[PDB]
A paper describes a structure:
During the early and late steps of infection with the Gram-positive bacterium B. anthracis, the tripartite anthrax toxin is secreted as major virulence factor in order to kill host immune cells such as macrophages or neutrophils. Like other AB-type toxins, it is composed of a surface binding/translocation moiety, the protective antigen (PA, 83 kDa), and two cytotoxic subunits, lethal factor (LF, 90 kDa) and edema factor (EF, 93 kDa). After cleavage by furin-like proteases, the truncated 63 kDa-sized PA monomer oligomerizes either into homo-heptamers (PA7) or homo-octamers (PA8). While PA8 can bind up to four factors, only three of them can simultaneously bind to PA7. Both enzymatic substrates bind to the upper rim of the PA oligomer via their N-terminal domains in a competitive manner.
We then determined the structure of the PA7LF3 pre-pore complex by single particle cryo-EM to an average resolution of 3.5 Å. However, in this initial 3D reconstruction the densities corresponding to LF represented a mixture of assemblies and were partly unassignable. This can be either due to the symmetry mismatch that emerges when three lethal factors bind simultaneously to PA7 or to possible different conformations of the individual LFs bound to PA7. To address these points, we established an image processing workflow that includes sequential 3-D classifications and rotation of classes. This resulted in three reconstructions with resolutions of 3.8 Å, 4.2 Å and 4.3 Å that differed in the position of the third LF bound to PA7 and the conformation of LF. The densities corresponding to the lethal factors in the 4.3 Å structure were not resolved well enough to allow the fitting of an atomic model (S2F). Therefore, we proceeded with the remaining two structures, combined the two particle stacks and masked out the density of the third LF to improve the resolution of the rest of the complex to 3.5 Å (S2H). The structures reveal that PA7 forms a seven-fold symmetric ring structure with a ~25 Å wide central opening. Noteworthy, the 2β2-2β3 loop region (residues 300–323) which is implicated in pore formation was not resolved in our map. The LF-PA interface is well resolved for all LFs and almost identical in the different structures.
Residue numbers in the entry:
A (entry chain B), D (entry chain C): 175 to 274, 287 to 301, 323 to 734
B (entry chain H): 217 to 345, 368 to 773
C (entry chain I): 32 to 279
Write the structure that this text describes.
């Protein structure tokens, strides 16, 4: 039996379909039989008879499907047509400031993607704006910063691997940037210190250990991160930073046939492979799971190249099926309940043109029908986002239609004079910055309790996942008073897009010019 | 069928077949590479013209041999197909004395030794003219009324043509005719004109084993075969040897009612053979055949047994028999406690059902030990080895082995039956092929013969100088006069057979039989328990 | 590295289990195999045959009733031993008999095989050849060459204490007057010669003895059988039968 | 005979069952015969026909069972289905403090485990609170600490290997942490100095030598462990420190067939193997032996992976049998007398769900019955702790039900006016902080001798394991007086959980608000 690619599997099997199936204790490779394998829940593999690794990453077609492989490659990447490679970005948990009266705020970071969008990781941190201290109005004064002073920046970060394969020795160099181009610092690539592993969906260091301190705390530079006044001003007006990271990972862990040992070979290095993967696969970005950008690459054919025409034709439907988890309970593509029709398709200009052609030779207008007839070619970039939410320039979930917001609140488990304990779907509370509470006199007056832009963070989360809104937090540590059991109690929610991050022109602090959505309205009797 | 065939032929799927359907793979594996070349011939075997073309093709090669045939050769070949029945006028003219008048008024129909055809023969013989001296003259007469049948002599003697079991003149005649026939078959089948040639022969199951032949055919519908007995027949049928002259056909022809075996025999270019004008071939004697498969087939609404076979040098099969001889002797010398090198279970077989005889030894003895008190076996085996006696399993008639003829010394003293015990040689003989007219299986035949030996040793221990049995002692003859007729009619014959019959029954595998002997002959039971005590 | 695994792997992995009792039969048969067959035919021709018991050799019908006094035996190395513990005894009489206790360790170890071969050599020298007085001048000549030789520990290896004290060279009369000692020396040499691992020791310390036994087992044992057969009347008569028949 | 995994043992043998058995002096491998091997007390091994090492650690299926292996690997790990790997944690024996009049206290450490528990070793020290010196009330003053001062920390530590395999060259880096995230110091990884071996259940340096001094005593840093005042305050209120250690061990010792030499191969390093083990085995934690957390890993099947389905099915009962020593005298699982029913089973949320399923397809509710029918899958975490003791958040033994405490004392070997000499079960005296002694007037009065919160450590242990309570220790070096031969003498015991570690609000030192259990009460004449 011929086998040109020298990858264990014979040619015909690779072209037509095969599957590995365990017979009591021995595993053997078999040609796909329609009737005996389908009942057993086995996947029909296909691959290239002329490629030692159809995806082009460092694991052979045979190794992947057979399980002889670094046991850390994520499961969904075991299928021969899904490239397995790392994607490391940096997540900053909190910062602190002073001058070479310590501004200590918690931060939230999200992996970003913007638009002709290219293969380079960047993240984006947002510093909390809410006033942890009552008296700390205006940062410029809480820290004695003068026109001729300089502030020091000291943050905590952890690395997150959201890819599909482990990195071993190296940790990426990564540069912090404020504004458009003001590079404050480049985080050194520590040497011979990352002897641990970053498996997919893991943190370094783990959630159980102190996070890696950004400032060295040693003698390398007394304050490496100096920062002039004007810069500090820029930061105060924008409250946003960027973290750009490159692709310099370590070596690769390979499987040895003589004894099954996985040793990090010093010859193979990810910086030689990534270009290959990136130039021969179609890339699909999905924010379905938890509104975070998950990126996968599928091996598609490229007409111009002989060796490349060898790869099995890949239709979009299958791509979604094998890369993310879509299935067919009733033949309708859906991801854990949500039908495929609730998602957007966005394409780069190239891919757009190509798909318009494909839709023309078939005489169809709605791609959601002819979904299983769209051929993927190499280098297409596709963005599938939930259709219900509003988005900003960096494709981060930022808001939503008010009506959806209301349905998300229609389940009042209990109500009293001390607050609400709701049970809301975990995804909505990442596009709500806070709530405005107000009381209405029986004759139409309006009293807003937390009537300051930076006093909205009143919604905490209990250990049983029930959100609890506390009135006494930014009140006077006093219960909630009502001048009339007929006075209505109104609760409003403020979406991210409509929030204010700095005092206005004339330093207005009132919540007047804020687009507010009605979220609750029960009279005194109900409470 | 088609599906399995397809998966097996396609190289890449063969392994899948073997993994999920092991048995199917084995069947198809054996099917497509030897039997397949077979079934083609039978298809051709249905067309008249193919039969006639191959027959004619076979003719010319033997044309030269046929054209040179003399009168003596053809006359001999004539005698071989049709036996010559004995002529009454010759025997009558051969007696002429007082014995014939004496014979005149004898209770003919009272001799068990005679068979039906011999009773008929004597009854019509009496157109030319009891517990005494007349059955001995009848014993002699039996050795003179047998038909002149060369082929019968050849299986009965197993190829040992010098057997002094018959009158000397007949012996010279037989040796001469067979040697002349041996000279006649000088042409080998070998040619450049033809490859594998298959020939056929229809055979009656009763010729190989009358024990299986009685229940082979379904009791209700004679067109079906009972699968249970079939599996037994097939179990250990692995090789066979033909010592006599095979009379084979060329084209399959319909068989008679009593022929249920349809042999397909392949030949070797070196096998010597003769051509017959009547579409038959005469093969040389002393041919060895290995059986490749045994199956049930259907033809014209009736069931049959298909048996194939391949001709090979007899020596190759003979080696199997000696190695079997060594395996059984080494195993039982250890199991009994006998000297390491003893020749005890020697068996010599030259017939069609050989392999079953050998394998059946490994069963008769297993049933023999587990059923008899260990100390009796050991003691009697010790007695037997103290002399030159050996057990002997054969597939030829008992009168031709070696030991039996020598010690009796009279020509007429010959006896043939299912089993036999020779005191002079202290040997037990078990003839497998025949079926006991009484016994249910072979094991019982063995135990019966064993009884005669035990009786001899038991009698030997009482006094060393005198040779006598436990019976003949006045303390047992009387016992035979009272209870002797309370069991089977066969044992009523005399004391020796009675003792043997009682011994098997007291040791039968069915406890019910034991109880029967308990409640029917209470005295004998304590007597037997008293002779076996001597240990 | 992959090469070595194979040999150790094979030595350790018994593919199938022979069985609980088969091993015993296979062990004994392999042991008796190494002795030249012609010795076995000579033994059978003179009568009794070797039977392998399984239990305590001290209690067997053939030996319990005879030679009760000789409970003291000396192994090949000269150390005493009691018959019950010993794993092989033999007896010379009207019925020459040899009894061996079955065990599973005759192929694996060697010290037990040496005692068995020693007993076969003792049967050979005392019971077979003695009927023809085969040990004679050639054997005496090698024997004599061993006593007088440069610091040859060979004596220590084959001679008992009784021999180391005969001052002069060996004499043909002595063998006649004393015939147990010489037959013993013969047996020892025979034993050391058959066992592969001890063969080298023999040739090393008693060269002439090794040469003698080598030519003896090589081409001087068929003559033993033929000459023994020349005593049997029936052998002579079968011989006449065959010769007269063929050329008749 | 085929043999794909190339591990010496043939396929059929590995799948069906085999065993190694020494025949007088030669060792041979045999297929398991049920009747002839069982009487000899031989174990029935099973393994994977497609894995050179079923556990996935660096010793072949063949090497483990045959004994050709580093003779240091612990016995329980010789069985082919139990992973052999190291588990190193740091034990601190005592500390000392001063200012850049030195408080030198002995400490006790316990290897910890807390809850969603992850694969990283950490320990926890507790500093003795009892007053060694009478006059040393309030640490803040015994050391002349000022608002603008800094204290120096100097401790002694030893490394403990509680795993099942040896480490060779390296010794792990480990960082001390006070509070939630305040890292005081990271103990350097000394270089080319741990040339000795840490066999399982051993200390480095051995118990017979001085422990490795934490402070260098050289010129590297004058006081590496600086610590601001506020830090010192947290420490004074809590007396707890955490020791987090990572997994950077050395190389691996391999067996050479040519000469039987065990050489440390510089290519293979435990930091490449541990991930494999950690992703393909079920982990069982047991505190049965001496109330210490012993962790073992057993090789279990993982349905999703072909090669992995090859491993023998593992039932919980057998796992406990082969990993820890449980046996069946009468068919009832037990560990040295204690029936299996005296233990709790706690499971991580995943494993919990999975086992609930397993209990559903069998229609049973009490797992203690159906124990031999529970299948183990990869990645389960199971925690088996003694049911009789109360536990804290870090699963350390901390208390117990009063009835057990009283029953543990019903054997009074001797009683006099100078103290008790008891013989108690070695495990209980690890949850008792001390005893309060009091004398009772014939009319109900109450006089507590050692009436101070920090005066409880009065129970010593004699060299024959007999506990001796000394009254004169925290008395006035005077015997015990009794105002009436009819007066009862009462003794109470205080378990750790109910102890106080700092003076109260108004600095109360009296044992008033302490939950005390009566342990003894004999009249004056019954002594």
């Amino acid at each position: 039996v011929p086998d040109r690619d020298n990858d264990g599997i014979p040619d015909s099997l690779e072209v037509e379909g095969y599957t590995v199936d365990v017979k009591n204790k021995r595993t053997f490779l078999s040609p796909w039989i329609s009737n005996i394998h389908e009942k057993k829940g086995l996947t029909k593999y296909k691959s290239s008879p002329e490629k030692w690794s159809t995806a082009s990453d460092p694991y052979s077609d045979f190794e992947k499907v057979t399980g002889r492989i670094d046991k850390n490659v994520s499961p969904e990447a075991r299928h021969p047509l899904v490239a397995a490679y790392p994607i490391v970005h940096v997540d900053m948990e909190n910062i602190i400031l002073s001058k070479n009266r310590t501004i200590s705020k918690n931060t939230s970071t999200s992996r970003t993607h913007t638009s002709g969008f290219s293969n380079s990781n960047s993240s984006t941190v947002a510093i909390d704006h809410s006033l942890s201290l009552a008296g700390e109005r205006t940062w410029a004064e809480t820290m004695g910063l003068n026109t001729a002073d300089t502030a020091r920046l000291n943050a905590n970060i952890r690395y997150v691997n959201t890819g599909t394969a482990p990195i071993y020795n190296v940790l990426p160099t990564t540069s912090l940037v404020l504004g458009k181009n003001q590079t404050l610092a480049t985080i050194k690539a520590k040497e011979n210190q990352l002897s641990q592993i970053l498996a997919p969906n893991n943190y370094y260091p783990s959630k159980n250990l102190a996070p890696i301190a950004l400032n060295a705390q040693d003698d390398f530079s007394s304050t490496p991160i100096t920062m002039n006044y004007n810069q500090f001003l820029e930061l105060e007006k924008t409250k946003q930073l960027r973290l750009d990271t490159d692709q310099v990972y370590g070596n690769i862990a390979t499987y040895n046939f003589e004894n099954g040992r996985v040793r990090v070979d010093t010859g193979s290095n990810w910086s030689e492979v990534l270009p290959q993967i990136q130039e021969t696969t179609a890339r699909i970005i999905f924010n379905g799971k938890d509104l975070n950008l998950v990126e996968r690459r599928i091996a598609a054919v490229n007409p111009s190249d002989p060796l490349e025409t060898t790869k099995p034709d890949m239709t979009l439907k299958e791509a979604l099926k094998i890369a993310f988890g879509f299935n067919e309970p009733n033949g309708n593509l859906q991801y854990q309940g949500k039908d495929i029709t609730e998602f957007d398709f966005n394409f780069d200009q190239q891919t757009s043109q190509n798909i318009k052609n494909q839709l023309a030779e078939l005489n169809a207008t709605n791609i959601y029908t002819v979904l299983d007839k769209i051929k993927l070619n190499a280098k297409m970039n596709i963005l599938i986002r939930d259709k219900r939410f509003h988005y900003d320039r960096n494709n981060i979930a930022v808001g939503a239609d008010e009506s959806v917001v209301k349905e998300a609140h229609r389940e009042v488990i209990n109500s009293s004079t001390e607050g609400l304990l709701l049970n809301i779907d975990k995804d909505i509370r990442k596009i709500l910055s806070g709530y405005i509470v107000e009381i209405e006199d029986t004759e139409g007056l309006k009293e807003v309790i937390n009537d300051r832009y930076d006093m909205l963070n009143i919604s905490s989360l209990r250990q049983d996942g029930k959100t609890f809104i506390d009135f006494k937090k930014y009140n006077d540590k006093l219960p909630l008073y009502i001048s009339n059991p007929n006075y209505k109690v109104n609760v409003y929610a403020v979406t991210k897009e409509n929030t204010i991050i700095n005092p206005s022109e004339n330093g207005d602090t009132s919540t007047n010019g804020i687009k507010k959505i009605l979220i609750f309205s029960k009279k005194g009797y109900e409470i | 069928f088609a599906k399995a065939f397809a998966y097996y032929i396609e190289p890449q799927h063969r392994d899948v077949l073997q993994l999920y359907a092991p048995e199917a793979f084995n069947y198809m594996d054996k099917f497509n590479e030897q039997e397949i070349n077979l079934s083609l011939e039978e298809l051709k075997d249905q067309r008249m013209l193919a039969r006639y073309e191959k027959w004619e093709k076979i003719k010319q090669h033997y044309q030269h041999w046929s054209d040179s045939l003399s009168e003596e050769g053809r006359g001999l070949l004539k005698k071989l197909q049709i036996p010559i029945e004995p002529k009454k006028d010759d025997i009558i003219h051969s007696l002429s004395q007082e014995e014939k008048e004496l014979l005149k008024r004898i209770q003919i129909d009272s001799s068990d030794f005679l068979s039906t055809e011999e009773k008929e023969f004597l009854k019509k013989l009496q157109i030319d003219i009891l517990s005494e001296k007349e059955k001995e003259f009848l014993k002699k007469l039996k050795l003179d009324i047998q038909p002149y049948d060369i082929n019968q002599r050849l299986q009965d003697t197993g190829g040992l043509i010098d057997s002094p079991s018959i009158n000397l003149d007949v012996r010279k005649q037989y040796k001469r005719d067979i040697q002349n026939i041996d000279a006649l078959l000088h042409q080998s089948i070998g040619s450049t004109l033809y490859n594998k040639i298959y020939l056929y022969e229809n055979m009656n199951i009763n010729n190989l084993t009358a024990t299986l032949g009685a229940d082979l055919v379904d009791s209700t519908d004679n067109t079906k075969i009972n699968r249970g007995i079939f599996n037994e027949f097939k179990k250990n049928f692995k090789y066979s040897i033909s010592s006599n002259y095979m009379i084979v056909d060329i084209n399959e022809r319909p068989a008679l009612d009593n022929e249920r075996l349809k042999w397909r025999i392949q030949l070797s270019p070196d096998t010597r053979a003769g051509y017959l004008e009547n579409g038959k071939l005469i093969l040389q004697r002393n041919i060895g055949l290995e059986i490749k498969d045994v199956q049930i087939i259907k033809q014209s609404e009736k069931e049959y047994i298909r048996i194939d076979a391949k001709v090979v040098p007899k020596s190759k099969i003979d080696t199997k028999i000696q190695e079997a001889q060594l395996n059984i002797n080494q195993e039982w010398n250890k199991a009994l406690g006998l000297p390491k090198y003893t020749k005890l279970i020697t068996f010599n077989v030259h017939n069609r059902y050989a392999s079953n005889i050998v394998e059946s030894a490994y069963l008769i003895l297993n049933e023999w030990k587990n059923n008899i008190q260990s100390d009796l076996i050991k003691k009697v085996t010790n007695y037997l080895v103290d002399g030159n006696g050996r057990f002997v399993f054969t597939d030829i008639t008992l009168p031709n082995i070696a030991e039996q003829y020598t010690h009796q010394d009279e020509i007429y003293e010959q006896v043939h039956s299912k089993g036999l015990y020779v005191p002079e040689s202290r040997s037990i003989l078990l003839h497998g092929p025949s079926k006991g007219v009484e016994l249910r299986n072979d094991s019982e035949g063995f135990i019966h013969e064993f009884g005669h030996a035990v009786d001899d040793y038991a009698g030997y221990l009482l006094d060393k100088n005198q040779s006598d049995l436990v019976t003949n002692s006045k303390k047992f003859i009387d016992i035979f006069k009272e209870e002797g007729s309370n069991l089977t009619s066969y044992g009523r014959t005399n004391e020796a057979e009675f003792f043997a019959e009682a011994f098997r029954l007291m040791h039968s595998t069915d406890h019910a039989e034991r109880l029967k002997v308990q409640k029917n002959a209470p005295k004998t039971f304590q007597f037997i328990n008293d002779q076996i005590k001597f240990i | 590295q992959e090469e070595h695994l194979k040999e150790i792997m094979k030595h350790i992995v018994k593919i199938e289990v022979k069985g609980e009792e088969a091993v015993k039969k296979e062990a004994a048969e392999k042991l008796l195999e190494k002795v030249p067959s012609d010795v076995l035919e000579m033994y059978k021709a003179i009568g009794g045959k070797i039977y392998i018991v399984d239990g305590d050799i001290t209690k067997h019908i053939s030996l319990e009733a005879l030679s009760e006094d000789k409970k003291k035996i000396k192994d090949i190395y000269g150390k005493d031993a009691l018959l019950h513990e010993h794993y092989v005894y033999a007896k010379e009489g009207y019925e020459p008999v040899l009894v061996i206790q079955s065990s599973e360790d005759y192929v694996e170890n060697t010290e037990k095989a040496l005692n068995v071969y020693y007993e076969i050599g003792k049967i050979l020298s005392r019971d077979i050849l003695s009927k023809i007085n085969q040990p004679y001048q050639k054997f005496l000549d090698v024997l004599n060459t061993i006593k007088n030789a440069s610091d040859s520990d060979g004596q220590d290896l084959l001679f008992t204490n009784q021999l180391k004290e005969h001052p002069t060279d060996f004499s043909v009369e002595f063998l006649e007057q004393n015939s147990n000692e010489v037959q013993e020396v013969f047996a020892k040499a025979f034993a050391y010669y058959i066992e592969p691992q001890h063969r080298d020791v023999l040739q090393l310390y008693a060269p002439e003895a090794f040469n003698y036994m080598d030519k003896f087992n090589e081409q001087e044992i068929n003559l033993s059988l033929e000459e023994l057969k020349d005593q049997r009347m029936l052998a002579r008569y079968e011989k006449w039968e065959k010769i007269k028949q063929h050329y008749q």
